[PDB]
A paper describes a structure:
A large fraction of cellular proteins likely start to fold cotranslationally in the ~100 Å long exit tunnel in the ribosomal large subunit, before they emerge into the cytosolic environment. In E. coli ribosomes, portions of the 23S rRNA and a few universally conserved proteins line the exit tunnel, Figure 1A. The tunnel proteins uL4, uL22, and uL23 consist of globular domains that are buried within the rRNA, and β-hairpin loops that protrude into the tunnel. These loops help stabilize the tertiary structure of 23S rRNA and contribute towards the unique geometry of the tunnel. uL24 and uL29 are located near the end of the tunnel, and a hairpin loop in uL24 forms a finger-like structure that partially obstructs the tunnel exit port.
The E. coli strains HDB143 (uL23 Δloop; uL23 residues 65–74 deleted) and HDB144 (uL24 Δloop; uL24 residues 43–57 deleted) have previously been shown to be viable, as is a strain where uL23 has been replaced by a homologue from spinach chloroplast ribosomes that also lacks the β-hairpin loop. Compared to WT E. coli ribosomes, the tunnel volume increases by 2,064 Å3 in uL23 Δloop ribosomes, see Video 1, about 1/3 of the size of ADR1a (5,880 Å3) calculated by the same method. The initial model for uL23 Δloop was built with Coot, and improved by energy minimization in a solvated dodecahedron box of explicit TIP3P waters, neutralized with chloride ions and using the Amber 99SB-ILDN force field. Even after minimization, the backbone of the new loop formed after the deletion of residues 65–74 still showed improper geometry and Ramachandran outliers, so we used kinematic sampling to model alternative loop conformations, and then we selected the loop that could fit the electron density and had the best Ramachandran score. The additional space available in uL23 Δloop ribosomes makes it possible for ADR1a to start to fold at 3–4 residues shorter linker lengths (Lonset). Assuming an extended conformation of the linker segment (~3 Å per residue), ADR1a folds ~9–12 Å deeper in the exit tunnel in uL23 Δloop ribosomes than in WT ribosomes.
Author numbering: 1 to 82
The structure:
Amino acid sequence: MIREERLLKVLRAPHVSEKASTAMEKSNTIVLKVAKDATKAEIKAAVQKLFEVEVEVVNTLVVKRRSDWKKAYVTLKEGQNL
């Protein structure tokens, strides 16, 4: 299933973009910069271990720019740290 060196690389940054603020304060959901491959199953596995929170669902999309950057919307349960 997992090898930790991959979880440490599957996430690349947090992402701040106004709808990223409204994703949290309205809809218990955090917005991330993830690997150019990744997959939703790995993105959930990375957040649930690095950030110690339960995850409900992960949805993904891309900026359509030269570096083809993968955004992830990770929805949490009820309470969160950051």
